[PDB]
């Protein structure tokens, strides 16, 4: 298991998520769905001259996945996945820039909502994780697990789990008072609302 | 000179686009800048891990040039570019699966100005432009110009103008009846609407 310290502008993004009075957490589950939508545009797109880059599996398609005895809630694609190199370097994101973006645009009048359109949306699932582990495999290297608690620091090591084929999967454990994100009715309206025409078949799986 | 068909999909949108009765034509700008944006984004990233992919520029930046005489509007960036299969194929863009899904959500009630939800804001363009050629260098590929008045048929052929170092040119030769986003204070208006928080400096040059 290898440890990493997040860049200082990363962890101070990750204090604000944690920190800032803000109500309106639902939208952690619109800029994960949106991060998955690119990453499985990312592997359409490659195949379209190259084939055999969907040898790993054909399948596009992001699943929702409620687990109420882990208090887990898991967000599933088979999108391009991320080599080692990309969940270092901040999950593929231009974090740096993007978090300097974000703050100078809260400071003009923007809302946390907004974080997506600066390239960070996955931190927003500190909004309502304790913890996130990533599992995530690319066709151009081995399957990885990454996790952060927050608190500065995050972890990589190569996943002996289940084997993924490819793509990523965010598994949000979930703070104490934030569980209505595991139940039916609440997952639906989110999608419903902030998700709805997102070009790939989004499965919210039953308990 | 290349001469290329459009994929039925993309022609369709295409003509979709030129036909359909529709006012708020102004946020083909919001798009091409969106598009600078995410180019922009790209070549940041892969620089982090390899900084010789800078030496062809290390500026990033969108620049918007009005040129009342050529009656053009053009969007130029110092992004990732594209490589000649890039430009034929819809412009890095997964266009068919991005087309299919924007009119699905045409169906269930989504307007126009979401097109670039669906990968394909690009062919806003043509809200306004009755032609549009596309400057493009990329670090692995010569400069290459794209071409396309619609009616189901585009160009390419290797540039011998204007070296760029890095990056794409959208060059806008606009109707006669849209010369208004060649005036200054529209576009200025249109950008502090619609783009006010993009992560890299927008000058808007003077004639």
Same sequence: chains 1, 2.
Avoid: C
């Amino acid at each position: 298991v290898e440890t990493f310290a997040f860049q200082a502008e990363i962890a101070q993004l990750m204090s604000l998520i944690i920190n800032t009075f803000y109500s309106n957490k639902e939208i952690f589950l619109r800029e994960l769905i949106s991060n998955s939508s690119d990453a499985l545009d990312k592997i359409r797109y490659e195949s379209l001259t190259d084939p055999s880059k969907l040898d790993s599996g054909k399948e596009l398609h992001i699943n929702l996945i409620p687990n109420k005895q882990d208090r887990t809630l898991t967000i599933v694609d088979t999108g391009i996945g991320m080599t080692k190199a990309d969940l270092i370097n901040n999950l593929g994101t231009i974090a740096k820039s993007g978090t300097k973006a974000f703050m100078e645009a809260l400071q003009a009048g923007a809302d946390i909502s907004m974080i997506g359109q600066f390239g960070v949306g996955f931190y927003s699932a500190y909004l309502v994780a304790e913890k996130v582990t990533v599992i995530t495999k690319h066709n151009d290297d081995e399957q990885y697990a990454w996790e952060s608690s927050a608190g500065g620091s995050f972890t990589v090591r190569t996943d002996t789990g289940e084997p993924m084929g490819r793509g990523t999967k965010v598994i949000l454990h979930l703070k104490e008072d934030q569980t209505e994100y595991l139940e039916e009715r609440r997952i639906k309206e989110i999608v419903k609302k902030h998700s709805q025409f997102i070009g790939y078949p989004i499965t919210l799986f039953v308990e």
